[model samples]
Target chain A: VGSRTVLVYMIAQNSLAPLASADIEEMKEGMRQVDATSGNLLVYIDDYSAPRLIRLGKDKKGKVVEETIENYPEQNSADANVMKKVISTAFNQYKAEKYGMVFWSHGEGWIPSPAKTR
Target chain B: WFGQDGNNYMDIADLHAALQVAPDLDFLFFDACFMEAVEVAYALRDCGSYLISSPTEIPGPGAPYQTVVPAMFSAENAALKIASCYYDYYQSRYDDGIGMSNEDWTGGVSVGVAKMSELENLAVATSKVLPRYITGKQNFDLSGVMCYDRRTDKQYYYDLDRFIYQITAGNGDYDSWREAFDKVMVYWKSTPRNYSAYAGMFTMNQDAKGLSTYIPRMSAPSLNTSYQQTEWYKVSGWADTGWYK
Candidate 1:
């Protein structure tokens, strides 16, 4: 049977520059806690540097390890298509029976459209 | 902001669209600012089972990842635990000024957990109250509303329960709305410092509840005009009630 996977979809392309470093620290904290046998912790980060898919887990020594699997060219982090691609690919690759998603970035809720700003 | 492409950020509508391709999420969590609004939650009613967020403008540092990460994997009351952990982390930081440059810099935190299944009922309850608000059948002190945001440019993310209470004046007829809201809102906690920040001094709103809702002020026609076009406002049935007139 396949395991469950928790994915954090972090879109940190531009103004959230500080978040790139800060949230990664948070991810590291999460990585230290993952029960690798039962589930996987995956993060698809689209930041100022570039878009990348990283997996967080522990090595045999029990130390946290961050493994970057793929990178993409710079793209708009707010693009729905980009997010859809990242989410589908990650979910397909992990093939988890259960899924949880986190949207980590600057959010103002359901007010004024992001497209307005774009 | 979702990216570094200028000020581009994902709105609720775009998020709804993005979530379309993802699997039906068990729960959705937002580690960003002003994300716990009912408008945002209702927009994603079909995307997830539960939603966890802070109605207020979160501090720069954001949620405590150390504790939050662990909770996400927990099997029991994960949402409630996450809210508690997030609230506790910020409360301690607010006390010790852990990462703040000044007392004012230490913007406090709040956490709210809502079940998505109840959001539609909450919306229907909202529709029930809209006519009263739109027809001038309901009116109350605008200043008494419990707002979440305390920035210089005020973002009107007022607490939904309190807004309803004030508008309905605790009328028995609207008890169902309150009940609907109560069902959707599972857990809520905030540091007293948050109320203090909102009051622009060390004062607390005794009626501070978890969820935030927007009530467009008539004076700000330009802003309200823009707000009316949002997907939340459209889906809320607020437009159908002739409130904008």
Candidate 2:
């Protein structure tokens, strides 16, 4: 993580400080991984890929909207395996030392991999 | 001993609750019948990337623990080694018994192995064909039953591969299915894990008999996934609209 002072001074627009801070924090976490996130699918690159990539307010559904394909990982199972390993290691080492770990995410029961259409 | 009602030894709710134990899991082994069913599998959908269980009820005396324990920690081929040892022991027991009786039972039970990831897609594609099966019910015969495993005084069993046969038995969908089967079997087939699946039942649709059936339990009209003589439940004298009397 870079110096907080440097970031605050660069983006003097106080109104956007929080969002900028959040993004930087995300980047710091990514960089800390060293090799973990470089090719890991969780790192989203294409902003124009999802339903509403640019946070264009909520869609008609009034939820955090985005173009579905652009934001979400199209091939999650492949990524899921890696995610499982990474998250498991992190949770086991840093978080509580319970017998197991759980992942909270939106799941489509018996649904296909990529929701190409919807 | 044979009803939907739970006894002191076993209960569905308890097992369902117990399955919530999450990841970093070293391995998962289901020693019951039908835990590999489309619905049950759907229930624990991604509980494990690699799952081992039967789609039918295996006989009692499943998983040969003693023979399998040594292989359990084997790194290179631990999973398959364990699973294959189970199958060999299971088949050998039956073979020995029948040979003593002057009846040759050389071959052991058939088994199935499925990649949970592969199933995620297949389930959806097959679910779409469900309504078509409902309309063609009478014209079809659904009698394949898949149980996960069973227990007896001595032996234990596992039935992952048996589930595969249930799904790929017919419908000529072998091409689409062969690849998935081959991959999982790499770690599961010929392993020494006792998977006791009950009577396995899988049926084909009378009309699209040519089309490859995706998930037999999901797409096939066969309802023989459970034990019959043991008598789980009997629905007799149902009306034409399927309102049972």
lDDT of each: 0.71, 0.30
* Highest-scoring model, TM-score: 1
TM-score of model number 1: 0.89
Each prediction's RMSD over C-alphas, in Å, is 3.1, 20.3
Clashes per candidate, residues 3 or more apart or on different chains: 4, 76
For candidate 1, give the lDDT of residue A3.
Answer: 62
Q: Score the docking of each candidate (DockQ).
A: 0.59, 0.01
Q: Candidate 1: which docking quality band?
A: medium
lDDT of 1 by residue, A13-105 (tens): 655666567667876876687677667778888775777888887889988788776687877767788778888877777876677777777
Residue B217 displacement in candidate 1 (angstroms): 2.1
Name the DockQ score for candidate 1.
0.59
> What TM-score, computed on C-alpha atoms, does each candidate reach?
0.89, 0.40
